[PDB]
């Protein structure tokens, strides 16, 4: 449309704006003044129609986003780069008989030590820039500006939690789809069949059995056995929301909840598992639209001509762009009737949050300081605990 | 030399690692683990063949590397640039000729002189960047990483000191070869000959000799003479190590009346006193492996296309590169039979080390701290004192 309004022509006059005084090295110096009228438009009160509209309140809505797996995070000292782990293999007790060679008292019996070696994590970062001259134009108190500068920082803390939660629930799905042996994998047919298999596979744990760990794919655990038990306070089911709303909707969940464990809190569920995408073919970045799309999510450092290695993760939806298609697949469970019953001690997860507030670079040319948040996060998954995958594949 | 061992193929996979995670903008973000087997490897033990091997001990040799020239250092102010010194040249007496006219009294005989304008020195610079991200992937103790961060810093001063003595040694040898007279040079024939021509070159520096200095290379002294003596408490003999070793094991160890004629208190010595290079013909940089060889010695600021002036000094073995052959000559005597017997206080050496440890720059984008070390060193040789070269 179009409006021949006296106020709207003053509002839409873009040559008077504050942006004209900050995108030109010479600009206006003195202000004449403006005739503001609220007649036959919006912002019109019944009394005193010539005053500029005034703000009742401004409200920074800050939601404290939380990493669901924060209680698993150990803290190391960020020294060295290889963590390894090892168990002792089973040696079942044998009967004694008093009619032997009796020099077998001299004989040896060593422990057997299945191990596995783990690499490193990666150091992740993010930055934000707060200035001192232009962003003061729209807060009208000092307190709102300080709350803004604080809420930007707390948002930079909360999206670390979002990143780590989505990253670990990508890890646990990529594991169960592409790494796990087909001995832990039970196969269902329908939804109630899968529910009965989940409820009998919870009870398949708490048993001294050597069947449910992948100790055969440890480094030295091929021959022999390794017996694992697990309590109920460290069993976590990872599944979908559409299937948590059916597992909890059974009488067995009621008798689990009554006089016992919080079964609503042991079943960790999401809408569909995976918004995280991997890389299968080593490509490069060519298009400026993809660069602007990566800038929209805070990825400031990547430019044209940068290459992406096979195995890189993204944590957001990338796959609609012109050169990611074909090279980028999704960590998503096939045939979404899906449940991965793990022991929560199998998630080897530790961080290094010591000194994650690096001192700011001031940049006094534009008077815009910048804070960086560096942290080290190691994500792995151990073979020495009970795991069961239940799918239709 | 091909290996199908599973642990060797596990190590040979360069795609898994600290390197590809730190080169790219996105990378893998978890680790499934690797089956490490010590069997049939260098890392094999007999009781447990499935662990990664261990370090108990990590050393870092530290050597301090002194200077052998810093009694000549005069701590100056570093203000202004042009210094200047002069002497008044000699005028011999003439005869009283009474036949000349009486207005010879009114003509002025001005005293003539010879100066030498020096100029500035060289602000010298080196830096080092210590990392907080990837240096800590080594150094299995925090104390080892702090020892490393201190050992780098203590190495920087050590190769300031050895650099300053290489430059002083090169200044004295390059001055002995190029800028001298015909009177100053001698020709020895062997080592037993040079060990006595040094002994008779002392007792020549301390006569009233208009020669043995180089005031003809001063500003006003092209025509005329200037006589200078020495005191033998000021004479420096600069030789190789072979000459001093030969003195101490043969001439001092095979004479009876040694009680007066020992000059080895005044002898500075070097094992091999040519290792420093110059420039001729004014090349520039165009090859990749040349600046790759320059990066190994700490020179970070050279890019391709940077031009090198006609008198620059390279101080390490540099003449084997593709560009520098024919344009770069070595400051060395051609015989390994060499003695430069010069008067001290002819070597001015004024370095400036006050604002030397400049405050760091923490670079938190890469989480690193760069430290700089700056000093101003002026070294020069006055042409107004007695010098003798003995060589081949």
């Amino acid at each position: 449309q179009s409006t021949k309004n006296e106020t709207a022509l003053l509002v839409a006059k873009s040559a008077k704006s504050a942006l004209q005084d900050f995108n030109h090295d010479y600009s206006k110096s003195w202000t004449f003044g403006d005739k503001w009228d609220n007649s036959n438009t919006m912002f019109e009160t019944f009394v005193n129609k010539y005053l500029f509209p005034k703000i009742n309140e401004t409200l920074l809505i800050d939601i404290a986003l939380g990493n669901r797996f924060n209680w698993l995070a150990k803290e190391q000292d960020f020294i060295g780069q290889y963590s390894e782990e090892y168990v002792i293999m089973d040696t079942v007790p044998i009967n004694m008989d008093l009619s032997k060679n009796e020099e077998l008292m001299l004989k040896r019996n060593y422990p057997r030590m299945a191990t596995k070696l783990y690499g490193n994590g990666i150091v992740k970062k993010q930055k934000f820039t707060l200035n001192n001259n232009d962003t003061r134009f729209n807060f009208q108190t000092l307190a709102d500006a300080t709350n803004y500068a604080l809420g930007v920082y707390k948002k930079k803390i909360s999206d670390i939690n979002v990143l780590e939660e989505k990253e670990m629930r990508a890890m646990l799905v990529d594991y169960s789809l592409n790494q796990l042996s087909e001995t832990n994998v039970r196969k269902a047919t329908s939804k109630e069949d899968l529910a009965s298999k989940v409820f009998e596979a919870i009870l398949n744990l708490q048993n001294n059995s050597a069947k449910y760990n992948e100790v055969h794919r440890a480094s030295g655990g091929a021959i022999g056995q390794y017996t694992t038990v697990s309590k109920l306070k460290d069993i976590v089911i990872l599944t979908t929301d559409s299937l948590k709303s059916y597992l909890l909707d059974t009488k067995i969940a009621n008798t689990f909840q009554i006089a016992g464990i919080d079964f609503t809190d042991h079943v960790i569920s999401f809408d569909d598992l995976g918004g995280v995408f991997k890389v299968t073919k080593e490509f490069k970045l060519q298009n400026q639209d993809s660069i602007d799309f990566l800038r929209a999510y805070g990825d400031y450092q990547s430019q044209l001509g940068d290459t992406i290695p096979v195995g890189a993760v993204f944590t957001y939806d990338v796959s609609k762009l012109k050169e990611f298609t074909g090279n980028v697949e999704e960590i998503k469970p096939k045939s979404d009737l899906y449940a991965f019953i793990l022991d929560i001690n199998s998630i080897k997860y530790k961080r290094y949050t010591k000194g994650m507030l690096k001192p700011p670079f001031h940049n006094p040319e534009f008077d815009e300081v910048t804070h960086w948040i560096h942290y080290y996060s190691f994500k792995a998954i151990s073979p020495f605990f009970n795991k069961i995958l239940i799918t239709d594949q | 030399q091909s290996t199908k061992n599973e642990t060797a193929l596990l190590v040979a996979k360069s795609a898994k690692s600290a390197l590809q995670d730190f080169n790219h903008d996105y990378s893998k973000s978890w680790t499934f683990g690797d089956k490490w087997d010590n069997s049939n490897t260098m890392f094999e033990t007999f009781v447990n063949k499935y662990l990664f091997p261990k370090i108990n001990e990590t050393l870092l040799i530290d050597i301090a590397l002194g200077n052998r020239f810093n009694w000549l250092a005069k701590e100056q102010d570093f203000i202004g640039q042009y210094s200047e010194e002069y002497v008044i040249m000699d005028t011999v007496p003439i005869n009283m000729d009474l036949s000349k006219n009486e207005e010879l009294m009114l003509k002025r005989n001005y005293p003539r002189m010879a100066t030498k304008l020096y100029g500035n020195g060289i602000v010298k610079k080196q830096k080092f960047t210590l990392n907080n991200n990837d240096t800590r992937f080594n150094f299995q103790t925090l104390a080892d990483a702090t020892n490393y961060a201190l050992g780098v810093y203590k190495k920087k001063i050590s190769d300031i000191n050895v650099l300053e003595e290489k430059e002083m040694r090169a200044m004295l040898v390059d001055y002995s070869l190029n800028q001298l007279s015909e009177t100053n040079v001698r020709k020895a024939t062997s080592k037993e000959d040079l060990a006595s021509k040094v002994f008779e070159a002392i007792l020549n520096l301390q006569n009233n000799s208009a020669k043995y200095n180089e005031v003809h290379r001063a500003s006003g002294g092209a025509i005329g003479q200037y006589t200078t003596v020495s005191k033998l408490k000021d004479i420096v003999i600069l030789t190789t190590d072979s000459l001093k070793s030969y003195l101490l094991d043969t001439k001092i160890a095979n004479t009876f009346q040694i009680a007066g004629i020992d000059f080895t208190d005044h002898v500075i010595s070097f094992d091999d006193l040519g290792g420093v290079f110059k420039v001729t013909k004014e090349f520039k940089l165009q090859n990749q492996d040349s600046i790759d060889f320059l990066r190994a010695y700490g020179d970070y600021q050279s890019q391709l296309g940077d031009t090198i002036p006609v008198g620059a000094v390279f101080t390490y073995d540099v003449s084997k590169l593709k560009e520098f052959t024919g344009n770069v000559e070595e400051i060395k005597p051609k015989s390994d039979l060499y003695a430069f017997i010069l008067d001290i206080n002819s070597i001015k050496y004024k370095r400036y080390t006050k604002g030397m440890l400049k405050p760091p720059f923490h670079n938190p984008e890469f989480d690193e701290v760069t430290h700089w070390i700056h000093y101003y060193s002026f070294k020069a040789i006055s042409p107004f004192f007695n010098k003798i070269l003995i060589t081949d």
């Binding site: 995070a73 939690n161 000194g355 | 201190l150 760091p360």
Partner: peptide, 27 residues
Amino acid sequence: MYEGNNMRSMMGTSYEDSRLNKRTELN
């Protein structure tokens, strides 16, 4: 193990690690 000039400028204090102040928000 040897101190020498131990507490030098900011990196020699950065390895003797500093400021465990901020952590993440659930637990």
